[PDB]
Amino acid sequence: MKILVIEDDALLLQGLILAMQSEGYVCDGVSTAHEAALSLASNHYSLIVLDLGLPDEDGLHFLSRMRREKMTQPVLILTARDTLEDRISGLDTGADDYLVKPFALEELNARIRALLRRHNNQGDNEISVGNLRLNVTRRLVWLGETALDLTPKEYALLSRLMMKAGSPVHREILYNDIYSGDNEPATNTLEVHIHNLREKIGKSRIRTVRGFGYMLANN
Amino acid sequence: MKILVIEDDALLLQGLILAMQSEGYVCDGVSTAHEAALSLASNHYSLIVLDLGLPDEDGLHFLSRMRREKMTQPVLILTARDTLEDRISGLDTGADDYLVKPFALEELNARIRALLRRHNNQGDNEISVGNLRLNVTRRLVWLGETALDLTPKEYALLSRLMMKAGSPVHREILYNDIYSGDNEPATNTLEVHIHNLREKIGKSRIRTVRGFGYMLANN
DNA sequence: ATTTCTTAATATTATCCTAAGCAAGG
DNA sequence: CTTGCTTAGGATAATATTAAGAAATC
Ligand code: BEF
Ligand code: BEF
Ligand SMILES: [Mg+2]
Ligand SMILES: [Mg+2]
């Protein structure tokens, strides 16, 4: 990923850039709030490091702005201010960790590591075949791109046939996918709800499997 | 927004629990790894807090199993084991922060407030859906120009609804979000309380999704 | 001494099922 | 001639809506 580092001390700033590289992050770094602003506006950064002791504009105000400016990225603070209130206020200004100087480098490498692992998979499990985009995580389906009203039975069938889409699903799989245990119905609802899915205005992407079951369209 | 607090020092444990409540979270404190684990199975937690010094099993061991079983929950260790080898080893295991004992409950409130600012929504408050301004730190919701008089459960429910806004939030979520452990109510609590949020002007901004929980709408 | 929560007992649907006839697969 | 399709008022289980008397909370 791409880290940006921010340090008023030059010897330090280089030491960091180089360290962040030893670990293998593509890394830029700067000694000015202004330049930090220009580089943020320039590139994409997965993580920021900071100092509150910036010479041009105070770091806290820069963070205040950065998120006020609706740039939301993880921001680690690495600072000389170990005052309790400083930890507090920083952490409350949108700062996702606070590391006091003097510090050990392997710690900073770990805190950054953890911050990034959390940042890393925010990914939503998704399945889209055709117009349909099924969101396993959001429980949102889209005949692309529009809302799909789905009763729980409808959604269960759609996602079972979406997950297996294109290779015919056997009838018993779909039946059980709907009513658990004592809930088992006597007649003709598999067909009723398959009918309803087909009636979504999405033009029958279900092909009927003659022997047993039903299948979904592919391309 | 219901925390689990895991500790084996009694006095401290009750204190933490009562403190977490004191901020407006809801909490289940436990004394050990098995209790913790079973408590993971049953309920749904916004954040957990961990101790390594448990008599049961070592907090880390549990964190390895937890996070290896793909429990994506944000952990925050807090322990009496301060060595740098300890914190790096803890973080890599791993936890989304670590804080050493002793400490000010205020640093803990700050790091947690932050950690959740990260997890649930991205970056910073305020989450704003439609005209509603929801500020995580200030505990206040605003409808357009004005504010709302929101009961605690009202604020928490609307909070979890705006966090996930645009997506239907399952019932069990809002439930576990409101009620801590022993305080689980037996009747109608959801629908009534939601009926009150709804009756607070802005209806209908909450779509009931049958078979599921309730969704918020931004368009 | 207000304010906020929980309990029922209520009233209102949304979603599933009831078959029973009509389409075809084969 | 067996297997899937379509048709709805009508049963079911889910949420809505109350109003009052518990708890909290001041
Ligand atoms: F002066 Be900075 F906080 F390192
Ligand atoms: F005793 Be525990 F590790 F704080
Ligand atoms: Mg400085
Ligand atoms: Mg301990």
CA torsion, ordered B106, A83, B85, B53, to nearest 10 deg: -20
Residue A179 to residues A172, A191, B51: CA-CA distances in angstroms? 11, 14, 43
Contact A214, A161 (CB under 8 A): yes
List beta partners, residue A6.
A30
CA A81 to chain centre: 32
CA B11 to chain centre: 22
As a whole number of angstroms, the distance between CA A110 and CA B107 comes to 20
Residue A7 beta carbon below 6 angstroms from any ligand 1 atom: no
Nucleotide whose C1' lies closest to the alpha carbon of residue A206? D4
Tokens of A16: 């960091």
Contact B212, B164 (CB under 8 A): no
Task: Count CA atoms within 13 Å of residue B66 on its CB side.
Answer: 25
In terms of DSSP bridges, do strands A47-50 and A75-79 run parallel, antiparallel, or are they unpaired? Answer: parallel
As a whole number of angstroms, the distance between CA B46 and CA B25 comes to 10
Q: Say what angle helices A105-120 and B84-91 make with each other, to 10 degrees.
A: 20
Is residue A5 classed as helix, strand or coil in its secondary structure? strand
As a whole number of angstroms, the distance between CA B217 and CA B219 comes to 6
Contact B62, B33 (CB under 8 A): yes
When CB atoms are compared, the residue of A67, A114, A140 closest to B167 is A140
As a whole number of angstroms, the distance between CA B173 and CA B43 comes to 9
As a whole number of angstroms, the distance between CA B110 and CA B177 comes to 20
CATH of domain B1-125: 3.40.50.2300
Helix or strand holding residue B155 (H, E)? helix B152-163
Nucleotide whose C1' lies closest to the alpha carbon of residue A198? D5
Contact B66, B73 (CB under 8 A): yes
Neighbouring CB atoms inside 10 A of A26's CB total 12
* Strand C atom within 7 Å of B189 CB: yes
As a whole number of angstroms, the distance between CA A101 and CA A108 comes to 11
Helix or strand holding residue A98 (H, E)? strand A97-100
Please give the resolution of this entry in Å, rounded to 1 decimal.
3.8
Contact B172, B211 (CB under 8 A): no
As a whole number of angstroms, the distance between CA A53 and CA B113 comes to 24
- Domain residue ranges in chain B: 1-125, 126-219
Q: Which residue's alpha carbon is nearest to atom 2 within ligand 1? A: A53
Strand order from edge to edge, sheet including B26-30:
B26-30, B2-6, B47-49
Q: Do A73 and B211 touch (CB under 8 A)?
A: no
Contact A160, A193 (CB under 8 A): no
Which burial class, exposed, middle or buried, applies to B83 when counting CB atoms under 10 A from its CB (0-12, 13-18, 19+)?
A: exposed
As a whole number of angstroms, the distance between CA B24 and CA B37 comes to 24
A2 φ, ψ (degrees, to nearest 5): -115, 105
Residue B100 to residues A183, B3, B87, B90, B183: CA-CA distances in angstroms? 52, 19, 9, 12, 31
Contact A133, B111 (CB under 8 A): no
Tokens of A71: 């740039």
Pick the CATH number of B126-219 from 1.10.10.10, 3.90.209.20, 1.20.1560.10, 3.90.76.10: 1.10.10.10
Please count the residue pairs, one from chain A and one from chain B, whose beta carbons lie less than 8 angstroms apart: 76
Contact B1, B160 (CB under 8 A): yes
Helix or strand holding residue B127 (H, E)? strand B127-129
* Strand D atom within 7 Å of A171 CB: yes
Q: What residue has token string 């006597």? A: A186
List beta partners, residue A129.
A132
As a whole number of angstroms, the distance between CA B16 and CA B104 comes to 11
Tell whether the torsion through CA atoms of B174, B178, B183 and B185 is positive or negative.
negative
Q: What CATH class does A124-219 carry?
A: mainly alpha
Test mutation, B71, B75, B91, chain A, max A CBs within 10 A: B91
Q: Kindly give the distance from the C-alpha atom of residue B138 to the centroid of ligand 1, in angstroms, as a whole number.
A: 29
Instruction: Name residue A215's amino acid.
Output: M
CA torsion, ordered B55, B57, B61, B65, to nearest 10 deg: -140
Contact B177, B2 (CB under 8 A): yes
Q: Kindly give the distance from the C-alpha atom of residue A82 to the centroid of ligand 4, in angstroms, as a whole number.
A: 26
User: For B80, which DSSP code?
Assistant: S
As a whole number of angstroms, the distance between CA A168 and CA B161 comes to 38
Contact B207, B217 (CB under 8 A): yes
A6 φ, ψ (degrees, to nearest 5): -135, 110
By the CB < 8 Å criterion, does A171 face chain B? no
Q: B191 CB contacts (<8 Å, ≥6 apart)?
A: none
CATH of domain A1-123: 3.40.50.2300
When CB atoms are compared, the residue of A92, A94, A114 closest to B95 is A114
A125 φ, ψ (degrees, to nearest 5): -55, 125
Q: Which of A148, A123, A164 is nearest to A201 (CA)?
A: A148
Neighbouring CB atoms inside 10 A of A176's CB total 12
As a whole number of angstroms, the distance between CA A6 and CA A149 comes to 49
As a whole number of angstroms, the distance between CA A177 and CA A162 comes to 13
Instruction: Name residue A11's amino acid.
Output: L
Is residue B51 classed as helix, strand or coil in its secondary structure? coil
As a whole number of angstroms, the distance between CA B96 and CA B28 comes to 20
Contact B50, B75 (CB under 8 A): yes
Residue A129 to residues A60, A148, A155, A173: CA-CA distances in angstroms? 47, 15, 15, 20
Tokens of B78: 């807090």
Is residue B52 classed as helix, strand or coil in its secondary structure? coil
Q: Which of B202, A201, A128, B135 is nearest to A138 (CA)?
A: A128
| B chain contacts of residue A96, beta-carbon cutoff 8 Å | 114-115, 117-118
As a whole number of angstroms, the distance between CA A214 and CA A169 comes to 6
User: For B168, which DSSP code?
Assistant: P
What DSSP string runs through A77-88? EEES---HHHHH
Tokens of B124: 């910073």
As a whole number of angstroms, the distance between CA A32 and CA B108 comes to 31
